[PDB]
Amino acid sequence: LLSVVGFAVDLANVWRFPYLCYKNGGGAFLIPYTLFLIIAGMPLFYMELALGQYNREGAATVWKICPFFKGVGYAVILIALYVGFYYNVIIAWSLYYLFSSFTLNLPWTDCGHTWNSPNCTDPKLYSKYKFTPAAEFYERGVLHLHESSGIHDIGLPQWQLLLCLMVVVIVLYFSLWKGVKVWITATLPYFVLFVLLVHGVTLPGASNGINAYLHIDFYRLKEATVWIDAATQIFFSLGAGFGVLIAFASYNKFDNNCYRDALLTSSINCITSFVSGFAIFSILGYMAHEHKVNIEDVATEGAGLVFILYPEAISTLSGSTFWAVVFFVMLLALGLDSSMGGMEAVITGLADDFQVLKRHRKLFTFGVTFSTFLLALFCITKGGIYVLTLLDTFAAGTSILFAVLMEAIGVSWFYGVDRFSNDIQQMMGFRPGLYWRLCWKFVSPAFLLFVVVVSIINFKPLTYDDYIFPPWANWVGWGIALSSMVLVPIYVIYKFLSTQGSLWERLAYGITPENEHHLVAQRDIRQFQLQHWLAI
Ligand SMILES: C[C@@H]1NC(C)(C)CO[C@@]1(O)c1cccc(Cl)c1
Numbered sequence: 001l002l003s004v005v006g007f008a009v010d011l012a013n014v015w016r017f018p019y020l021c022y023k024n025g026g027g028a029f030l031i032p033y034t035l036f037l038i039i040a041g042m043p044l045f046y047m048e049l050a051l052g053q054y055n056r057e058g059a060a061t062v063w064k065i066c067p068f069f070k071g072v073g074y075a076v077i078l079i080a081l082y083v084g085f086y087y088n089v090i091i092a093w094s095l096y097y098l099f100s101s102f103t104l105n106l107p108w109t110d111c112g113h114t115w116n117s118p119n120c121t122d123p124k125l126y127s128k129y130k131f132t133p134a135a136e137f138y139e140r141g142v143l144h145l146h147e148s149s150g151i152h153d154i155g156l157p158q159w160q161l162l163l164c165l166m167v168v169v170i171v172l173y174f175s176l177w178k179g180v181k182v183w184i185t186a187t188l189p190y191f192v193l194f195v196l197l198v199h200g201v202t203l204p205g206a207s208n209g210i211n212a213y214l215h216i217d218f219y220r221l222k223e224a225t226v227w228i229d230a231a232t233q234i235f236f237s238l239g240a241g242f243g244v245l246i247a248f249a250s251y252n253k254f255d256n257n258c259y260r261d262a263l264l265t266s267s268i269n270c271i272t273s274f275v276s277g278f279a280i281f282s283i284l285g286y287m288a289h290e291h292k293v294n295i296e297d298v299a300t301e302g303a304g305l306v307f308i309l310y311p312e313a314i315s316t317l318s319g320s321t322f323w324a325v326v327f328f329v330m331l332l333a334l335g336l337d338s339s340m341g342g343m344e345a346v347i348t349g350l351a352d353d354f355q356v357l358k359r360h361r362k363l364f365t366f367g368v369t370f371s372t373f374l375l376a377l378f379c380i381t382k383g384g385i386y387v388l389t390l391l392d393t394f395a396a397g398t399s400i401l402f403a404v405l406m407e408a409i410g411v412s413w414f415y416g417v418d419r420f421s422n423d424i425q426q427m428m429g430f431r432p433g434l435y436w437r438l439c440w441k442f443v444s445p446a447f448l449l450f451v452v453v454v455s456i457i458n459f460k461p462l463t464y465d466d467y468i469f470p471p472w473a474n475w476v477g478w479g480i481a482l483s484s485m486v487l488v489p490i491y492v493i494y495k496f497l498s499t500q501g502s503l504w505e506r507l508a509y510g511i512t513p514e515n516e517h518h519l520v521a522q523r524d525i526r527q528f529q530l531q532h533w534l535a536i
Pocket residue numbers: 010012079080081083084085087088235236237238239240242244337338339340341342343345
């Protein structure tokens with residue numbers, strides 16, 4: 001009713017999906033997206049919920065079921081800590097836009113302002129990009145991009161965005177320092193999306209936007225970037241791979257039916273994503289028709305697409321100020337909820353792992369939030385959109401795909417998928433069934449390993465709209481990705497080193513659950529008997 005409704009919608013759903021869908025064509029992004037959501041996203045969501053709910057442990061410490069894999073929990077915690085660096089900058093932007101949308105005549109409509117350049121063009125009077133009043137506001141008035149030569153020269157933070165990020169981090173801390181623990185913040189995004197869909201589809205030229213959306217081109221599906229984008233967006237929206245589902249479900253009741261939650265969340269995700277893309281392309285069609293430019297080159301396909309679209313739509317509704325205020329309140333509340341969820345994943349994992357941390361949640365919360373603030377200072381610089389692009393590309397990229405692949409492999413092969421299904425039948429009365437066992441053991445790891453190998457061997461040098469990141473920027477992005485990814489083999493080669501006993505003793509102790517470590521002394525384990533692995 002409300003739980004799955006608010007739960008489903010996320011900032012990653014109304015901010016990242018729009019420009020990922022624009023950049024990857026129109027509906028050509030919804031075929032890979034839906035494919036993964038059906039095959040490798042819904043089973044992974046259900047698996048994460050079941051894991052967290054049965055084991056009662058956070059992202060990091062849920063690996064008492066197969067010790068060698070605690071590195072996977074550490075990797076997901078690191079991925080979350082990374083994403084939290086640039087996920088607070090989006091909320092800083094939302095806060096700045098809510099602050100600047102409190103005037104009658106909004107700023108992003110005309111360009112007789114002070115941040116406008118002598119190149120601006122107002123449609124109410126051939127790189128049409130970044131010359132429209134709203135694009136010049138976002139770039140020149142908020143980010144101050146015009147003061148950064150690139151990712152090599154990023155000036156000092158913008159005191160406006162500095163204050164906004166500071167307030168956001170203060171809100172996060174003060175809402176996250178006491179324990180882990182309304183309906184309007186879960187109903188609003190859907191209502192704003194409904195208003196946008198209706199009005200947009202009423203807009204002139206939105207017919208061309210909807211046609212470009214519905215016109216599926218397959219030469220683009222044949223490429224490797226659309227599938228990587230779809231997979232990363234599915235794991236970025238539904239949560240599988242951030243240690244957030246496990247941490248949140250550990251507090252769910254035991255008899256809680258996580259299968260219902262998985263089904264409803266996937267359904268709502270698919271539906272709302274189709275609708276959001278529909279509305280976004282209606283707004284793109286209107287922008288392209290009013291600005292006299294093609295739909296494929298009317299706006300930025302980067303991290304600031306929605307901050308140019310949604311002002312463009314706001315400014316075409318009656319009483320557009322009320323709409324600006326309400327839409328940016330919605331965006332800010334969604335951002336705060338999602339960032340609090342990610343920070344809670346991190347804190348709950350690292351506290352469930354280290355009791356010394358769980359004793360002091362004030363100090364640990366302060367540490368985590370102060371770290372995220374100091375590291376977002378980089379993204380809120382004058383060339384901070386470049387660092388934000390770097391992080392968005394590499395923070396949760398092949399890193400998240402690899403983490404989720406290793407988690408699925410662990411649970412489905414080393415901990416057994418028949419064992420997992422027996423746990424399910426224990427906490428829910430019904431066995432998951434053939435479809436889910438098959439998507440956990442074979443189909444999900446297959447798809448995810450293919451997408452990982454592709455994202456590695458089909459990686460396109462990082463670039464902003466018309467800016468080619470220098471080579472070392474890609475080097476640093478891959479350093480980030482690997483730092484996130486290299487924790488699994490490190491922790492395995494560690495476990496195998498800090499367990500006294502024969503080679504097979506050490507390969508069992510790290511592969512058996514932590515409670516049934518008295519069954520290993522006999523040299524009798526399931527993983528060793530070569531029948532476990534035939535558990536389809
Ligand atoms: C973007 C993510 N979408 C989820 C649904 C998985 C909820 O968590 C997130 O909001 C998140 C994850 C990790 C760190 C941070 Cl700061 C935020």
